[PDB]
Design a binder for this molecule. Sequence first.
Ligand SMILES: CC(C)C/C=C(\C=O)C(C)C
Ligand SMILES: CC(C)C/C=C(\C=O)C(C)C
Ligand SMILES: CC(C)C/C=C(\C=O)C(C)C
Ligand SMILES: CC(C)C/C=C(\C=O)C(C)C
Lengths: 617, 617
Amino acid sequence: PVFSKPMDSNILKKRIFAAVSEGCVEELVELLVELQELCRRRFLMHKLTASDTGKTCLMKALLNINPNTKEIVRILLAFAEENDILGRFINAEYTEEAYEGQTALNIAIERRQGDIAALLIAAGADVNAHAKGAFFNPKYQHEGFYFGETPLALAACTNQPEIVQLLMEHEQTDITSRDSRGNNILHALVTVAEDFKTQNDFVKRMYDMILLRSGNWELETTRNNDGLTPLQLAAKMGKAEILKYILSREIKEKRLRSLSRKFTDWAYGPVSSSLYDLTNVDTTTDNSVLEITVYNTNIDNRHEMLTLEPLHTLLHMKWKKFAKHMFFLSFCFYFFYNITLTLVSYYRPRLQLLGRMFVLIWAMCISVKEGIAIFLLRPSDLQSILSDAWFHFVFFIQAVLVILSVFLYLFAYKEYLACLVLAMALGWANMLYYTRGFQSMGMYSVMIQKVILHDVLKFLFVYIVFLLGFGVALASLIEKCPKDNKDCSSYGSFSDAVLELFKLTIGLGDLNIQQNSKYPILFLFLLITYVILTFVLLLNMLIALMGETVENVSKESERIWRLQRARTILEFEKMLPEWLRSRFRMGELCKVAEDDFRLCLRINEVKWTEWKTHVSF
Amino acid sequence: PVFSKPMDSNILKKRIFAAVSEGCVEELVELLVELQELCRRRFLMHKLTASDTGKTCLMKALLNINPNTKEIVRILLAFAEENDILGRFINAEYTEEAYEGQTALNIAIERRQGDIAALLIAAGADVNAHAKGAFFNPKYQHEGFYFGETPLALAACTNQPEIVQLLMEHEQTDITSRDSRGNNILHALVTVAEDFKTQNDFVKRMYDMILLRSGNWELETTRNNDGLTPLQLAAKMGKAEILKYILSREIKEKRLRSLSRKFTDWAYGPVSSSLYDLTNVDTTTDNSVLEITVYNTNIDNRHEMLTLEPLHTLLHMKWKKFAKHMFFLSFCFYFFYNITLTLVSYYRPRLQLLGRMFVLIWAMCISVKEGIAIFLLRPSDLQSILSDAWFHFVFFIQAVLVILSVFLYLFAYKEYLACLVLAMALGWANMLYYTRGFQSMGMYSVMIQKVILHDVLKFLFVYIVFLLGFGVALASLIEKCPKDNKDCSSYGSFSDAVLELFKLTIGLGDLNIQQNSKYPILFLFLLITYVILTFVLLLNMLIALMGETVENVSKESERIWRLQRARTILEFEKMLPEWLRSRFRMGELCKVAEDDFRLCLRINEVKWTEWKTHVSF
Ligand SMILES: CC(C)C/C=C(\C=O)C(C)C
Ligand SMILES: CC(C)C/C=C(\C=O)C(C)C
Ligand SMILES: CC(C)C/C=C(\C=O)C(C)C
Ligand SMILES: CC(C)C/C=C(\C=O)C(C)C
């Protein structure tokens, strides 16, 4: 965080700023009387405002607060009344690029002072004046303080509800005012919340106050500049507490029940048949909160908010309804394609040609989907943890290897086997993708990907360094055995010596010690020290590396597997044509409203743990 | 949980239901006067009751409670007094299949209201009216709310004891009333309890109140529809707190001491000689709580309630008395059978025939017990965790292989060795069953079964996929070496290539790189990538998989072993003939009662930790 200029720096007009900084009033009141007539003996009181910055004495007084500050603000404003410049004095604007648009009301609200803040507003302060500075609108979280760039949202982003209540009651205040980010009062509150459960979080408590007092459906429907309602913004930023509050918001009182996203129908002991609203949760529209929350648009907090009631059962009625019947079909139609690819080519000649045609019409079928899936892929997802993109190359590669091989079959480049037989080894290793449909083995394949990434690549990369150095060092010592024979040359070339070192790691071959080295002692010293760096230092410790991996993750392995399946639930859903997606939850109900455009959903909740505890008191 | 119709849906007779729903009375009292004479100008007031459902205004008023509801129920009943239809109005019944039999008293009791509930009962409410609906009687735990289908048990299943106390004092209330499940007031309380220790659990507190006020032995002896006393039902559902309370129930006061299952004889400091009752705990009868609690009829909570005092020492005096003397005999008589099977057949000819006869008369002896044990087995136990059934096939298979082999011995099909020599390898691996009699190694064999199931099968299943794909891929590249010789063909067929890959995993053989591949580079690329998927990715990680297994279980391995032994304690007991089971605990004592049919048991309890803490205050 680097800012070119500071807001307040306590390092003949300087007497104005010095007097208000230390809070001294006696040196100011008599001296302010003197200033009254400098302009007369000379309409535009420049002298009491700074030049390089727009900061005035009013901003200077409030930025350097003290118990004497209240005694200064009242007389400072009275000076502008005599010169009739209170309009320009109160609405004075900062001019630095970092802090631009900050007014005296903005600083008074920040410094936890409802006394002067009410006084300035009553004096004609510019309510809903936007602080459109680079500092107030940081490019990241740590580059500044973003709060919505309005005095109302600043009091809302801070924990001062009294100044909020005063600002709501003001007539000139524009509630549905959008700042330079296209945000709102509710968008700003969503950004400043946190996903970590805090005992005393005012954001969801103040979300209720601002929304209810507005009492209409325009704050929750106003779109962002990127294009995002306050509902969807909480999903993009991963705000679970706000998402749980918004999706399950029930208003008991009349005249405001239209602001409810969940209308409980009936309750009887543990079971209650709540009737939720999903007018912006189902994937019928674009950028749904369900679609946003399952992809890697949220960070480090997905399952704790993918289990929320309106959308936890949205996936179950998508899996148990059409996704399960298409995972088997994808499993069967790929198992048969792999079996046919193996069968018709293991029996290759050194009428079953209709089976070979099936591989032709299906390798193109896989690659046309993978080819179009690569285009929708982005580098922001290609290298990540929950990418689900590595399976998009290897499905494409195994498909593109088959069609490339057969193009060289009839054309007879003799390389038709160099590409086809690599598809068998990859095609059968691709069969492990379709094990997500089982909990016991789907969690197992989750462990494999974490093991193959955190530990195996780190072991191999060190290993080739010990294989390149020791391969060259061992092969360099060996002269050419006489008689021009291939004997004496187990370590004769770099490729021959590296291969013999690799066979030493697994445990295959004979460890000869008289391999025609011109230093027999040095060759053995370099041999009985290679196996203590790999077999004793690395291979045993490789087993040790993965123990930290399978102990920290095993309590989250069942959590990551569900997110894999929940992604394929809607990845399958987008493949259905528009006429096929005519099967949805339920019709329009829950309210007369605007002629009932409320796509509701009835899910009964039988909760035994809470009800048992509730009656226990 | 899916219900076709809702109980209460707040989405010219509709004015009746609307007025009571919102609690408005002014719009009802004058309008109810109007209704009085619609039927006259027209015995059967249909108009104020619903048609598709039996719900009336009384049910509608109580389902939509409000502070004005008490002001509505009193005048609503007075309307039926004038028409003299209070009998049909109060006893009005629901008619939906989901919710059937629900009355106005049932809803009033549910909504924590003892005021109206007492008023309805005083008005002639149908006490002990059964709500025999599909919702009130769910097929599972999450399909509804089961509470015993009576107003008394509903107040008991909820935490309202005042309405219970009122219902006990009523004359018309039938305490020993059985619902559609054959349950009782005490059966229903057992079902709604929980095995997790809760600080404030009313169920065992309300079990005391209902049983004592009844003051007789008919609630604890009334059989279920499945056939189960309230004692045995707590064992089937795994209710440890109720089981600990019931089995150790001591009533101090006279006239009710006959309702005690434990009569403490004397106490002196730490040692107290409690004298328990096991009239339904010992295995003398069928479906004993001891027999039920040791088999896999309880779930996830067995050792925390198999250690309860009446039945923790019931097994110790069965092990130290006849079970230990039959485990050695089973160990010796099977060790000798295995030794004889090995000895008389390792020396097979390429008079000791009496030893061969012993295997004949004992292989049939094993298979006749295993054959009859398979019939008593069920698929509900065949595939489980604490099955103790896998040892029933392999004991049967090893027994059936011996008799099958000798049938081909004299008959001379020459296959007599193909079945007999497989019995040695299985017969000696069966010798590890009889290691349950030792703590150090019995816990070891518990680890093996968990390791062999959670980890080894998951590793092998992935391994054959990498062996099928790489076996075909390696064998496909190899042409037939000239001269029609068997050289050049280490990977010549599928079986030859798969075998050479398996030997690569363990570490046997020579890793040749010039194995007559028509692509020497591609064969090596497919070879130095198979060993990084098994030897580097799988075999090392296999060791890693079992580390989560031996760290989470080792604190429970000593717990599962006891349940294995406790099952064989009564598995041995059922083998004794009726005359042999003439040795039991102790006679009839502890009370005069009904001519003393109380099979008691005296077990002295020397408790030093509690007594030391008790005197410390
Ligand atoms: C390209 C062939 C060598 C198969 C490659 C793999 C599968 O075995 C990788 C993905 C592990
Ligand atoms: C043997 C390979 C194919 C396993 C590696 C993966 C597949 O599961 C990726 C996803 C890490
Ligand atoms: C049938 C023979 C091969 C013995 C089989 C086993 C014992 O070694 C299995 C039970 C592990
Ligand atoms: C070598 C085998 C016989 C071990 C496996 C078992 C026996 O202990 C079953 C019970 C898992």
